[PDB]
DNA sequence: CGTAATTAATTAATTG
DNA sequence: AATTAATTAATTA
């Protein structure tokens, strides 16, 4: 097989590499890598190396990496550019793997682990590690085994062995319900003392050294705790054994508070799953505890136990260990669904970077671009210092707040990356500037043509047309991968809807789910067989379809993120190819494109309807337009339609056969106007929205910019079995909004768009009536807890203290003096509740750590003094008032003449 | 060390 | 309560 790296480090003058060799075995080598850097040389000197602008370079080959670094510094003292890859391990990888890497994941040791630490005096700080480690569960992907290291004897209690028999039993049998599919995969090792547990863990680590190290909060807790505990007991050199090269870096981090240190293990790639989740999930959660995320992702019940965690080992060691193991499994279950490890490996190997560098799109793009240029013997420019400067972004249209009955939306495919490709925007393709006219002059096609030679953006930039820049070339490659996966995602989604339809009439039999590839639209024979399936088979298939869709979604959305991050990197000072002329050429072109096509769409529809000056485009943001279709529907008459799906078909057909051709013509003209390299402005139909035929639903509404709701029947080719609410920006979409309120507001909106005014009034009346029975967590607001210290004056709110910070300060006073009560962690999330006047907490609100029950000491008082009236007005009535006034509806039935009868 | 546009909630100070 | 400036949090794209 083809070889691939596992890990790479620079340690002084050595590269330490772990790799899989041609036979599929893991090896390590230390290489005295001799790096090369480059300097400009005279034009009349023969060389094969050129910088990105075509200037000739001479190669400087150094005896070691230290000399290369010292040369860089001397070139600074002289005042001359030092060209080439200054990150020597990336040059090493490029030299050693001068080909497209084909990796085999089954050869990569992916370790998932978690530790338990009993602590009587509060949270066990990793940098102190003063408490014994009493449990470690370490899953190894190669063995497919959970290795359980259990401490039977501790200063905090002596316990009996964990029983795998009880662990397997149902909770109703007094067991721990450890999933049966992992029971056989557990290797249980009990220990008489902590020293031997840790010594054996380290020997184990030595034999099964993680390549990818993951788990939940392992970067901030497990890794620092284990390192420091071993350091405290055995000395530093023994702790360093967690690195295969015996080198570590301790950093008492310095950017915004937090002096609790993170440990870098050389020769290991740490991908903390919390960080993977935060970057790649496209969620913002109210809480990031494993219980909360597990429940959200997998629909598994919370891990339940009596008493505080500080007494769990002592009171119920059996459950203590069982839950440690389950915790480890849950991360694996989340990854089976989300596939962030797969994504990280794909991205890392494609770019040829340390896998952990996937968190940095700048590093990722620096390496991709470097490798691409190196292929042609081109030399990358030196990184430079830049002051941070603001620059202009997208255009957002001010919508008229209103109900909108029939809406067809259109959307530009992968806009900013397509602009890069269309215009040919790259550091080395800059050809010059032209004299800009005001933007609206380009929008209206009255400004003079920017250039008859070069490809142009309305910000004034000109680009060469003779050849594609490295940025367009490389962004194109990742875009095409993205497109392939989006195609799989959409097919799985369409397939999901076929299954839902068939679920309306399940057959009465014992059968099995069909063995199908869900990434492809079901064939006619599959569709026929589905119509004969049982509910159980159909449900399992739906689950599988939806799992395929999620897999597709991860692969596609994160490749979209990567390409959009290349645009973003052009606007970040730490990017080697940072250039505000390029970033601004992209955004300015976007503003023109949107407004240009708004004008064209209005012109086209005014023609086809025989009107003049009618505004058909009601809204747009960045790259999307929302077109009112009321007149289109009214031209045929609602009476002609058999059902909802009939007008949805009509609009779908009108969009595809009439509007899209016109839209294409308009963008082709714009391309010629800007003299661009390639027409890549593709604006396809996104949404078809409207009320159910014959209903009193309003269909949709806008309250303002980035705040709207639509009742959608079809989304980019997916015809829904049930209409789906597309709600953007409103309180239902915000993690800060109480869960019960999100739900209730979503139902108000549903009733508005699908059923009408009366249905909404009926529901509101009921919600207001029953509101007070709702669980306190369900009606708590959520916020991030930043800068607590700044606003803390003696334990009371300082000037300008934010509402949620006040809540925290109240909480601190309430629990002050208690070492064991949950502390609010700076930068973490908190639940927030209003408090009625005259309460014992001495303020108007209380906040506590999110995802948790409030400590039992003050729970009864919070529940007693919760201000339900303030909660209702602030979180529910206020936004609903906003929705309904924008929609011209009343959430409460107003008086009428009819009130004088019966 | 990916980006900008934009919203709502909030505090402080004002709005004769 | 409204409006205005400044902060904060969180979205849409
Ligand atoms: C979501 C997102 C968008 N944008 C910018 C760049 C996008 O091209 C532009 C439009 O956003 P989107 O319409 O959300 O996405 P897209 O057009 O790039 O890709 P597609 O529609 O095919 O899924 O907004 C970012 O810069 N960063 C982001 O994270
Ligand atoms: Ca735990
Ligand atoms: Ca788009
Ligand atoms: Ca689309
Ligand atoms: Ca059937
Ligand atoms: Ca869009």
């Amino acid at each position: 097989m083809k070889e691939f790296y596992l890990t790479v480090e620079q340690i002084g003058d050595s590269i330490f590499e772990r790799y899989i060799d041609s036979n599929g075995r893991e090896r390590t080598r230390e290489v005295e890598y001799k790096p090369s850097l480059f300097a400009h040389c005279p034009e009349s000197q023969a060389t094969k190396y050129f910088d990105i602008y075509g200037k000739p370079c001479t190669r400087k080959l150094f005896a070691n990496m230290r000399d290369a670094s010292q040369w860089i510094k001397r070139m600074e003292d002289i005042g001359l550019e030092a060209l080439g890859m200054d990150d020597f391990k990336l040059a090493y990888l490029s030299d050693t793997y001068n080909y497209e890497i084909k990796y085999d994941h089954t050869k990569i040791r992916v370790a998932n682990f978690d530790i338990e630490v009993t602590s009587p005096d509060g949270f066990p700080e990793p940098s102190q590690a003063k408490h014994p480690i009493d449990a470690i569960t370490h899953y190894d992907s190669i063995d497919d085994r959970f290795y359980v290291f259990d401490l039977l004897n501790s200063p905090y209690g002596n316990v009996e062995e964990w029983s795998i028999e009880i662990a397997a039993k149902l909770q109703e049998q007094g067991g721990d319900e450890v999933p049966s599919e992992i029971i056989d995969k557990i290797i249980y090792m009990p220990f008489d003392n902590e020293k031997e547990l840790l010594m054996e863990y380290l020997n184990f680590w030595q034999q099964k050294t993680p390549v990818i190290l993951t788990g939940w909060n392992v970067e901030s807790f497990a890794i620092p705790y284990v390192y420091n505990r071993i350091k405290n007991i055995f000395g530093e050199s023994t702790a360093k054994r967690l690195s295969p090269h015996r080198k570590t870096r301790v950093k008492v981090i310095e950017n915004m508070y937090g002096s609790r240190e993170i440990i870098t293990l050389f020769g290991i790639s740490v991908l903390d799953y919390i960080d993977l989740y935060k970057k790649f999930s496209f969620t913002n959660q109210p809480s990031y505890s494993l219980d909360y995320i597990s429940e959200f992702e997998l629909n598994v019940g919370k891990l339940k136990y009596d008493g505080p965690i500080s007494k769990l080992r002592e009171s119920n060691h059996q459950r203590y260990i069982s839950y440690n193991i389950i915790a480890v499994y849950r991360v694996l279950q989340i990854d089976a669904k989300r596939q962030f490890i797969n994504l990280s490996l794909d991205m890392g190997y494609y770019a040829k970077i340390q896998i952990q560098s996937v968190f940095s799109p700048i590093k990722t793009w620096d390496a991709i671009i470097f490798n691409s240029l190196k292929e042609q013997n081109k030399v990358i420019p030196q990184g430079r210092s830049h002051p941070v400067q603001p620059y202009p972004g997208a255009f957002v249209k001010e919508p008229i707040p209103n109900r909108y009955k029939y809406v067809m939306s259109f959307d530009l495919t992968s806009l900013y990356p397509s602009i890069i490709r269309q215009v040919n925007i790259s550091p080395e393709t800059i050809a010059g500037t032209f004299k800009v006219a005001p933007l609206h002059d380009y929008i209206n096609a009255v400004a003079e043509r920017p250039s008859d030679v070069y490809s142009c953006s309305p910000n004034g930039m000109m680009y060469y047309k003779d050849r594609d820049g490295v940025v367009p070339t490389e962004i194109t490659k990742v875009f095409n991968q993205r497109k392939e996966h989006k195609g799989y995602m959409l097919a799985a989604q369409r397939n999901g809807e076929i299954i839902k339809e068939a679920l309306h009439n399940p057959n009465l039999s014992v059968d099995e789910p069909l063995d199908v590839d869900y990434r492809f639209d079901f064939s006619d024979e599959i569709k026929e067989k589905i119509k004969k399936l049982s509910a159980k088979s159909l449900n399992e298939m739906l689950f599988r379809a939806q799992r395929t869709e999620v897999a597709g979604m991860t692969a596609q959305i994160n490749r979209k993120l990567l390409i959009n991050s290349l645009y973003g990197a052009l606007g970040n000072v730490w990017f080697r190819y940072y250039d505000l002329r390029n970033a601004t050429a992209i955004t300015t072109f976007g503003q023109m494109a949107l407004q240009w096509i708004e004008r064209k769409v209005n012109e086209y529809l005014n023609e086809v309807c025989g009107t003049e000056g009618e505004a058909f485009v009601l809204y747009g943001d960045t790259d999307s337009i929302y077109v009112s279709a009321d007149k289109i529907i009214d031209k045929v008459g609602e009476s002609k339609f058999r059902d909802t799906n009939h007008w949805v078909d009509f609009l779908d057909k009108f969009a595809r056969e009439r509007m899209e051709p016109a839209i294409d013509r308009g963008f082709r003209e714009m391309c010629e106007y800007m003299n661009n390299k390639q027409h890549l402005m593709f604006m396809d139909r996104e949404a078809i929205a409207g009320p159910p035929l014959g209903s009193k639903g309003i269909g949709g509404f806008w309250t303002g910019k980035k705040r709207y709701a639509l009742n959608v029947w079809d989304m980019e080719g997916t015809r829904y079995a049930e209409p789906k609410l597309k709600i953007m920006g409103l309180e239902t979409q915000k993690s800060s909004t109480p869960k019960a309120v999100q739900k209730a507001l979503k139902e108000c909106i549903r009733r508005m768009l699908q059923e009408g005014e009366e249905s909404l009034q009926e529901y509101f009346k009921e919600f207001e009536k029953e509101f007070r029975q709702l669980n306190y967590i369900s009606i708590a607001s959520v916020s991030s807890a930043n800068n607590i210290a700044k606003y803390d004056v003696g334990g009371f709110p300082g000037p300008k203290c934010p509402f949620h910070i006040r809540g925290i300060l109240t909480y601190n006073r309430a629990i002050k003096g208690n070492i064991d009560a949950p502390q609010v962690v700076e930068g973490e999330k908190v639940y927030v509740l209003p408090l009625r006047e005259g309460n014992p907490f001495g303020d108007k609100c209380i906040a506590w750590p999110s995802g948790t029950e409030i400590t039992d000491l003050i729970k009864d008082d919070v529940l007693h003094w919760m201000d339900y009236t303030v909660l209702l007005e602030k979180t529910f009535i206020k936004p609903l008032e906003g929705f309904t006034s924008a929609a011209k509806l009343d959430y409460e039935k107003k008086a009428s003449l009819f009130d004088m009868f019966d």
Side-chain angles (χ1 to χ4, degrees):
Chain A
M1 61 175 290
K2 277 277 185 177
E3 294 179 60
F4 62 98
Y5 68 95
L6 294 167
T7 66
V8 66
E9 305 286 0
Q10 179 189 341
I11 302 167
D13 290 317
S14 286
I15 291 299
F16 286 76
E17 191 201 358
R18 296 169 69 200
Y19 68 112
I20 298 302
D21 71 19
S22 51
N23 299 299
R25 292 131 157 208
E26 183 176 334
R27 289 222 218 98
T28 305
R29 52 169 168 231
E30 167 176 3
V31 179
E32 298 187 55
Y33 183 59
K34 308 226 294 195
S36 288
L37 293 164
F38 299 81
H40 289 123
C41 58
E43 300 269 31
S44 59
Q45 187 207 114
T47 182
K48 70 172 184 170
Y49 308 104
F50 300 85
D51 75 9
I52 64 173
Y53 311 104
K55 283 127 64 69
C57 294
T58 174
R59 185 160 70 103
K60 289 281 207 293
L61 188 266
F62 298 94
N64 46 64
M65 290 177 287
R66 188 209 207 104
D67 284 5
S69 289
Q70 286 291 102
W71 182 74
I72 287 174
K73 277 167 270 300
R74 289 189 224 105
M75 288 296 275
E76 183 189 3
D77 300 337
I78 290 167
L80 283 170
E81 184 176 11
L83 292 91
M85 177 48 76
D86 53 315
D87 187 344
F88 301 130
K89 65 203 171 289
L90 294 189
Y92 170 79
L93 285 184
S94 188
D95 283 336
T96 311
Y97 305 92
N98 192 358
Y99 50 88
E100 179 174 56
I101 295 169
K102 181 77 186 296
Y103 73 97
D104 178 351
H105 72 93
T106 74
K107 302 291 195 286
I108 306 173
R109 196 170 302 273
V110 178
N112 171 33
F113 89 119
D114 201 19
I115 75 168
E116 302 296 330
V117 181
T118 292
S119 179
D121 57 10
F123 183 82
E125 284 305 310
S127 71
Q128 306 290 111
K130 62 174 182 184
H131 304 113
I133 295 165
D134 51 35
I136 309 174
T137 294
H138 182 121
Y139 173 86
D140 183 283
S141 71
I142 288 172
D143 292 342
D144 193 13
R145 294 292 183 268
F146 297 87
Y147 295 88
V148 187
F149 298 79
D150 180 14
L151 177 62
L152 302 197
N153 303 322
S154 169
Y156 307 136
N158 293 330
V159 293
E160 293 299 300
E161 281 189 36
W162 171 83
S163 164
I164 193 166
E165 295 82 8
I166 298 165
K169 288 189 199 299
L170 315 174
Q171 298 238 345
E172 297 84 8
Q173 288 176 274
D176 304 318
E177 228 164 313
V178 176
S180 62
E181 74 272 10
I182 76 156
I183 285 296
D184 291 345
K185 304 189 178 184
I186 298 165
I187 301 163
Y188 175 71
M189 295 159 288
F191 287 94
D192 289 328
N193 68 92
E194 195 195 1
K195 277 172 188 151
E196 78 173 18
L197 185 166
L198 288 173
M199 284 185 285
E200 178 55 41
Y201 188 65
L202 288 170
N203 289 149
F204 161 89
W205 193 277
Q206 228 82 291
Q207 289 303 332
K208 302 172 197 290
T209 312
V211 165
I212 307 298
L213 190 53
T214 190
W216 200 261
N217 230 241
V218 295
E219 192 188 33
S220 62
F221 186 73
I223 298 161
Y225 203 96
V226 170
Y227 184 82
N228 279 305
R229 185 68 185 168
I230 291 169
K231 182 163 159 280
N232 289 346
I233 295 165
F234 299 108
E236 212 171 43
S237 83
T238 303
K240 282 157 159 45
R241 284 175 61 206
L242 291 166
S243 162
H245 317 300
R246 311 295 183 254
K247 194 197 176 62
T248 64
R249 181 86 68 252
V250 184
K251 38 170 61 65
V252 181
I253 231 285
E254 209 268 64
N255 56 307
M256 192 191 179
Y257 266 77
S259 49
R260 279 83 194 97
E261 79 186 40
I262 56 164
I263 311 298
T264 304
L265 310 166
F266 284 70
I268 293 171
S269 295
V270 179
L271 302 169
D272 195 326
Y273 217 91
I274 198 170
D275 294 329
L276 291 173
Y277 193 91
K278 283 169 176 193
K279 191 181 176 60
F280 301 130
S281 70
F282 286 79
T283 66
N284 197 354
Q285 297 290 6
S287 168
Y288 287 93
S289 70
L290 188 52
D291 274 336
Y292 194 92
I293 304 298
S294 289
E295 144 81 330
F296 179 92
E297 293 291 325
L298 311 165
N299 278 257
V300 288
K302 202 207 78 161
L303 253 31
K304 192 226 82 205
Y305 57 92
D306 301 354
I309 217 273
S310 64
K311 293 175 180 181
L312 189 51
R313 183 183 174 267
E314 194 175 23
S315 58
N316 196 343
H317 177 252
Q318 172 69 32
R319 183 144 283 165
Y320 190 73
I321 300 303
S322 282
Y323 281 9
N324 178 231
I325 296 164
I326 291 169
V328 172
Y329 187 40
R330 285 178 167 194
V331 181
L332 291 164
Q333 285 181 114
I334 291 160
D335 198 60
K337 182 183 180 200
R338 287 291 199 150
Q339 302 176 187
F340 300 149
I341 305 297
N342 183 70
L343 173 76
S344 295
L345 295 163
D346 280 354
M347 280 186 52
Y349 284 118
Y350 180 85
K352 302 178 192 181
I353 53 174
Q354 300 188 116
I355 310 298
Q356 68 270 31
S357 284
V358 297
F359 295 117
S360 166
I362 288 175
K363 181 55 73 154
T364 299
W365 280 115
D366 196 41
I368 291 160
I369 290 156
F370 160 62
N371 282 277
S372 180
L373 293 173
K374 183 174 157 283
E375 261 267 8
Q376 309 147 248
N377 299 318
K378 297 185 172 191
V379 172
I380 70 182
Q382 189 174 23
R384 285 158 164 88
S385 185
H386 310 277
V388 180
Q389 280 188 306
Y391 72 94
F395 173 77
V396 190
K397 194 192 161 71
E398 193 72 66
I400 300 171
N402 211 342
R403 61 178 74 182
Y404 293 90
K405 197 181 178 188
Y406 293 104
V407 179
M408 314 200 65
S409 75
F410 296 79
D411 169 73
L412 280 148
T413 292
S414 192
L415 183 62
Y416 285 14
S418 305
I419 292 169
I420 293 187
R421 299 167 60 204
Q422 161 150 351
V423 183
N424 201 28
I425 295 167
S426 206
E428 82 285 22
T429 57
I430 292 158
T433 60
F434 63 91
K435 193 152 61 174
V436 301
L439 190 56
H440 59 262
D441 283 354
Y442 300 111
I443 294 166
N444 293 311
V446 285
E448 67 181 345
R449 209 162 171 269
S451 182
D452 282 323
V453 181
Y454 303 116
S455 165
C456 299
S457 171
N459 80 323
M461 293 296 285
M462 304 200 289
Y463 302 90
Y464 301 128
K465 304 183 67 171
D466 68 299
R467 69 192 194 274
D468 276 350
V470 66
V471 163
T473 304
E474 294 306 319
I475 216 180
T476 297
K477 285 169 197 176
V478 184
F479 167 74
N480 290 331
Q481 299 177 0
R482 188 276 172 130
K483 185 173 181 181
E484 183 195 8
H485 291 284
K486 187 175 176 174
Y488 299 150
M489 184 196 84
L490 290 176
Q493 180 176 100
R494 293 190 294 271
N495 287 340
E497 296 301 307
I498 297 167
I499 295 163
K500 287 172 192 172
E501 278 280 337
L503 271 162
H504 296 325
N505 291 108
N507 293 48
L508 350 64
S509 62
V510 174
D511 49 22
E512 300 290 351
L514 267 47
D515 192 33
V516 291
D517 193 339
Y518 292 95
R519 307 169 295 159
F520 299 97
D521 289 295
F522 291 150
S523 70
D524 293 321
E525 68 198 294
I526 291 160
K527 279 184 270 199
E528 290 309 291
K529 266 177 266 195
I530 283 164
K531 288 193 171 178
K532 290 172 183 176
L533 286 179
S534 64
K536 199 168 87 74
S537 282
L538 283 181
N539 281 145
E540 180 54 35
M541 288 187 67
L542 184 54
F543 182 81
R544 292 172 185 182
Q546 287 175 154
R547 281 302 182 83
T548 301
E549 181 179 351
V550 171
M553 172 67 96
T554 291
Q556 77 85 11
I557 205 161
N558 286 300
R559 277 167 180 85
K560 171 183 165 166
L561 176 63
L562 188 61
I563 59 180
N564 290 338
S565 293
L566 179 55
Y567 147 69
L570 297 171
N572 180 293
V573 296
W574 302 98
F575 196 38
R576 191 182 304 275
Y577 314 98
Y578 171 79
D579 196 329
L580 250 31
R581 300 170 300 179
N582 286 343
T584 301
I586 295 162
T587 69
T588 309
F589 190 98
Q591 287 204 9
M592 178 187 62
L594 186 53
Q595 286 162 104
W596 174 283
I597 212 69
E598 175 189 9
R599 177 179 63 88
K600 291 283 190 173
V601 169
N602 281 334
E603 290 180 359
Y604 177 72
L605 288 171
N606 268 285
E607 271 196 316
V608 85
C609 299
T611 46
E612 194 250 46
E614 175 84 44
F616 284 90
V617 175
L618 66 101
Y619 184 69
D621 180 341
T622 307
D623 72 324
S624 71
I625 51 157
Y626 292 78
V627 185
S628 180
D630 291 11
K631 286 177 166 65
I632 306 306
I633 291 299
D634 289 347
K635 268 228 79 182
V636 337
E638 285 197 15
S639 303
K640 266 76 162 193
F641 297 111
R642 282 175 283 98
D643 49 32
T644 303
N645 205 54
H646 189 194
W647 69 257
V648 176
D649 282 337
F650 172 74
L651 287 193
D652 179 48
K653 204 169 182 174
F654 189 85
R656 191 169 60 256
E657 306 188 336
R658 305 295 172 192
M659 287 179 78
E660 287 179 16
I663 280 161
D664 296 326
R665 294 192 296 270
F667 272 130
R668 277 193 281 274
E669 181 181 287
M670 192 187 79
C671 178
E672 279 203 56
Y673 190 32
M674 290 300 106
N675 194 37
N676 294 142
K677 187 156 186 302
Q678 197 181 344
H679 161 60
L680 292 165
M681 292 298 96
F682 305 139
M683 170 177 265
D684 294 322
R685 193 269 294 174
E686 199 102 301
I688 292 179
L693 219 215
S695 74
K696 303 171 172 186
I698 65 163
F701 69 88
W702 263 259
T703 87
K705 285 181 178 176
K706 300 176 186 294
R707 285 186 62 89
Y708 63 92
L710 294 167
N711 186 55
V712 181
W713 300 90
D714 197 298
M715 187 68 159
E716 59 203 332
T718 301
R719 189 65 58 89
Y720 295 123
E722 300 296 331
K724 179 158 173 56
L725 305 174
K726 191 191 156 63
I727 305 160
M728 304 308 302
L730 309 182
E731 283 69 19
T732 61
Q733 308 315 105
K734 298 172 74 71
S735 63
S736 45
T737 300
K739 221 268 85 48
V741 176
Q742 291 177 336
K743 189 172 162 60
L745 288 173
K746 197 176 176 186
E747 183 58 14
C748 289
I749 292 166
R750 194 197 65 77
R751 289 172 175 253
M752 284 165 75
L753 315 188
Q754 294 174 8
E755 295 166 11
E757 181 170 53
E758 198 178 328
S759 177
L760 180 260
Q761 289 164 181
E762 166 184 283
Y763 190 74
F764 170 88
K765 205 204 281 93
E766 205 56 61
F767 190 72
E768 192 180 63
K769 216 108 157 191
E770 318 293 346
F771 179 75
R772 296 163 180 269
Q773 301 150 221
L774 293 160
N775 179 261
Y776 76 107
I777 290 161
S778 84
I779 47 180
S781 291
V782 183
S783 187
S784 292
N786 294 315
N787 286 304
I788 303 161
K790 171 189 260 196
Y791 293 102
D792 188 328
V793 177
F796 290 98
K800 256 274 194 158
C801 183
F803 190 81
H804 60 289
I805 304 300
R806 182 179 292 274
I808 293 158
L809 289 179
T810 309
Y811 177 80
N812 287 351
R813 291 194 315 278
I815 73 153
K816 167 148 39 70
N818 299 336
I819 43 91
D820 63 292
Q823 301 293 138
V824 169
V825 177
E826 166 71 35
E828 276 202 321
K829 289 194 187 181
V830 285
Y831 288 129
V832 184
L833 281 172
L835 261 15
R836 299 196 309 272
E837 203 185 71
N839 67 82
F841 299 103
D843 217 325
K844 66 177 176 177
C845 59
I846 196 158
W848 73 102
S850 75
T852 68
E853 289 279 326
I854 191 156
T855 173
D856 274 307
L857 288 156
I858 54 163
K859 185 182 169 173
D860 58 307
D861 293 308
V862 171
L863 282 171
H864 184 269
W865 291 97
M866 271 175 78
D867 203 331
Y868 290 89
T869 300
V870 166
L871 270 177
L872 183 63
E873 291 296 338
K874 268 164 41 172
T875 71
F876 181 78
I877 292 180
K878 207 183 194 308
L880 184 63
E881 161 68 32
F883 305 164
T884 53
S885 52
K888 325 271 210 216
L889 268 78
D890 286 313
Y891 62 90
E892 290 188 310
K893 190 178 174 186
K894 35 91 171 186
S896 87
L897 269 30
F898 279 87
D899 298 327
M900 289 165 173
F901 297 89
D902 190 62

